Structure formats: C-alpha cells, structure tokens
C-alpha cells in the first residue's frame, strides 16, 4: 500500500509514539509498533461529538516488530479542527494520547516521472507532482544528488513555487550520479513531514571531451 510513506515517517519520529499522517487532506492513517504482540483499541473524538472506535489492522515488519494502524472515515477528516486520538490496551492501560489537526500532519505522496537529461554542459531534471494532488502551486520540492563510494549526498537543492524543473551544474565528469526528489507543503498553514523519496534515476556524466 503506502509502505514508503509510513517508512519515511517512522524514520523521522521513531516507533515510540503514535504516528499519524494525511496525503490529500481527506484521509488519515495512524500507526505504531509493538515488540514481538497484545491487543489494542483505537478510539478518537472529533470536537465535542461522541467518541468513535476505529477498526484496527495488524501486520509483521522486517524488524520483527508488529505494526498496528487505523484508517479514519473520510467524514471525520476535517481540517483546522481539534481531533483527539487515543490508543488503549486490552488490559485497559493507556498507551497513546494525541490531539491533532489534520492539516498539521500532511505527508504528501512521493513525486513521480523523474527524468534526467543533459544540457549541452549540465544536467536537467524534470519530474511530476504527487498523483491526485491538486495543490501543485503550493508544493515545494527538494532534489538529492548523490554518488557512489561513500560520497553520499553531494547536493541538496530546494525548489519552490510548485516548479517541477531543476538544473544541476557542479557535476564531475565520468561519474554516475543518482537523483531523487521529495515533496512538501509550501504554505505555513500546513504542518507535517517530507514525502518519501521518489524512485531514483541515475545518469552517467561524460568525461571532458
């Protein structure tokens, strides 16, 4: 499903708290981890409306941990509104307790259609905004430029105002560079995290000739 989105969020905050995020301001997924099990009861309260139970799903992870999650009903994904979350163990013990706003946990979907081309003496990058995300004008991006043999991330370029094009300049000849792009809400009215990295695209720069 959205394994890449949950993996990015887990790498940001860790497995010791209730991780919640939205992709298109009309959804909400909350998940956490447990050592491997046990049973839990997810419940939320929207404003002053009576409490609601949420259906919980379970799944093992590569780490050997067990991941629980809940997908909120679309009717309860209103923004700019207090949403109180609670995870209670089957023993009755309180586990997690949060009060969030949907607009403050935005994690967009990863950018797609990344393409690398030569300038003729630079490298031009083009990509597409997150699928089914109409706020393209209010999305800022970030491009990664990395290499092999422990070089790591050589360049990190910020792209603003919903532009989907980038021109790289300081690249060494006879070098295979790997590019990836992440997305974020530009408008300060939203809170959240960077999207998962896009599917990488590599390109081999020519030696000087």
């Amino acid at each position: 499903p959205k394994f890449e989105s949950k993996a990015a969020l887990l790498a940001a905050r860790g497995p010791e708290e209730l991780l919640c995020f939205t992709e298109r301001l009309e959804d909400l997924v909350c998940f956490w981890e447990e050592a491997a099990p046990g049973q839990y009861s997810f419940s939320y309260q929207l404003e002053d409306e009576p409490w609601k139970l949420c259906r919980l799903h379970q799944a093992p992870t590569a780490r050997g941990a067990v991941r629980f999650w809940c997908s909120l009903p679309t009717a309860d994904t209103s923004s700019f509104v207090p949403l109180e979350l609670r995870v209670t163990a089957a023993s009755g013990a309180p586990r997690y307790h949060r009060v969030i706003h949907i607009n403050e946990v935005v994690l967009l979907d990863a950018p797609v259609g990344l393409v690398a081309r030569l300038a003729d003496g630079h490298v031009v990058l083009r990509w597409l905004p997150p699928p089914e995300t109409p706020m393209t004008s209010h999305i800022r991006y970030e491009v990664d430029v990395s290499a092999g043999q422990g070089a790591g991330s050589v360049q990190r370029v910020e792209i603003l105002e919903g532009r989907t094009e980038c021109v790289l300049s300081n690249l060494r000849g006879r070098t295979r560079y790997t590019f990836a792009v992440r997305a974020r809400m530009a408008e300060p009215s939203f809170g959240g995290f960077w999207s998962a990295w896009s599917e990488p695209v590599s390109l081999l720069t020519p030696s000087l000739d």
Partner: antibody, heavy 118, light 112 residues
Framework: EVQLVESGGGLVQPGGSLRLSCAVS????????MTWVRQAPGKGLEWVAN????????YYVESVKGRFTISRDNAKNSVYLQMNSVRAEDTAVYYC???????????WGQGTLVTVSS | QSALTQPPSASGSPGQSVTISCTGT?????????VSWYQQHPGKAPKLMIY???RRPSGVPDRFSGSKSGNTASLTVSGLQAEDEADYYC???????????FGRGTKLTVLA
C-alpha cells in the same frame, strides 16, 4: 450557546492606532483558530488576519501586513486586532470569527465599525 | 480587493431552484476542498451555510446544497422561501496570506 462580541471600534484619524477586542464564550476557545473579516459599507467580505489556537503563528492579508497585529488570550477567551498606521481603505465593519471545519467560519460576532477618512 | 467571480444578482419564485456559481483559479477552489458559502441578511453578520464544498452545519435546511467542478463551486437552493432573500458569498482557502478569499457577492431576490 456560542457568543462572540466585538468592541473598541470608532472613528480613527489616518495613521493613528486602534485596538479591537472580541469576548468569546460558548466553546473550547483555546483549541480553535480565530480570524478577523472586515466588510466595507456596501461592499463584500475581506479576510484580514487569523491566529493559531496556541497563538504561536499569525497570518495577515498583504494590504495590512506590517500594520496590523493579531493576538489572543486563552485565559480570558479574548481575541485582539491591533490596528497601527490606519489607512482610509481600512474603513469597514470588523467581525471576529471562529474557524471551523475546512477553514470555514462557523460562528460570527455582531461586528464593530471602524471609520477612517475617505 | 481581489475576489472570486460571482454573478451580481439572482432571482427566483417560491418553490423554484436557483444556482449561484463561484469561479476561481487552480490555486484556490480547484486546489483545495476548503470551499465555504455564507448567508448575510442586511445589517446582520454572515452565517455559515455550507462548509467543505458540500457539507452543511446543523441548523441549515436540507434545501441548501453545494458542489464543485474544476475551479467553480455552486450553491443550490431547491425550496425557495421569503426568508432566503439575502446576500450570498463563497469562500476558499488560497494560501496562508489569504486564508479565505471571498467572492464579490450575490444578491438573491425572492420574487412573487
């Protein structure tokens, strides 16, 4: 019953200063955004400024940027709109409002009038 | 003041249905689902009638409904009544520096 009451309006000379107040009661005040919307007499509605529940972040419309200052008190349940360096085009009826679902304005106050020159 | 596009006036006999359009750009109405409609009687404060494009607050009659296609929202009153004669504004999120861009306003007149 939800109640919002504005006050502090009146005539102000161009370049002067004025402070508007909004007494709020009827809901959990410290968990919602609060906003100001003005309306020139015989004209439409214009969004002025809003503030986060904890009042950590403030946002303004471009025409009042650097001139107005919105604030709140989550103990007295009050919203303030400091109006410095007033212009003639700031002449309008200022409502304080509660931001609800989808960035809508669920509850509005009676509104207070601010008149400036032309 | 920059605003959204609304027809200046609209009319309709009791029982009929009137649709008020609201056209914006792809950066506000066509970008977010934060579309709201308001009703304002003369001398009174605006009243929320529609939030989130189509959803409707408690107290607002079933006669009122909203929709969205492209960059244009539409308010529809199916059962016209005398108490519906007022001004109608549309709003939409258009950024942090403009949390709610209203329209020019539409004066709905209930005919005989």
């Amino acid at each position: 019953e939800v109640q919002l009451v504005e006050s502090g309006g009146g005539l102000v000379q161009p370049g002067g200063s004025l402070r508007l107040s909004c007494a709020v009661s009827g809901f959990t005040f410290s968990k919602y955004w609060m906003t100001w919307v003005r309306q020139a007499p015989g004209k439409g509605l214009e969004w002025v400024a809003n503030i986060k529940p904890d009042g950590s972040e403030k946002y303004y419309v471009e025409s009042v940027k650097g001139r107005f200052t919105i604030s709140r008190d989550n103990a007295k349940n009050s919203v303030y709109l400091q109006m410095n360096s007033v212009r003639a085009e700031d002449t309008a009826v200022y409502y304080c409002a509660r931001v609800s679902r989808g960035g809508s304005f669920s509850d509005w106050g009676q509104g207070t009038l601010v008149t400036v020159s032309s | 003041q920059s605003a959204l596009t609304q027809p200046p006036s609209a009319s309709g006999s009791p029982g009929q249905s009137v649709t008020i359009s609201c056209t914006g750009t792809s950066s506000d109405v066509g970008a977010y689902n934060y579309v709201s409609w308001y009703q304002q009687h003369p001398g009174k404060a605006p009243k929320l009638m529609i939030y989130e494009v189509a959803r409707r607050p408690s107290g607002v009659p079933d006669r009122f409904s909203g929709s969205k296609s492209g960059n244009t929202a539409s308010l529809t009153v199916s059962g016209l009544q005398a108490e519906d004669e007022a001004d109608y504004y549309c709003s939409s999120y258009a950024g942090s520096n403009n949390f709610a861009v209203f329209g020019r306003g539409t004066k709905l007149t209930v005919l005989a």
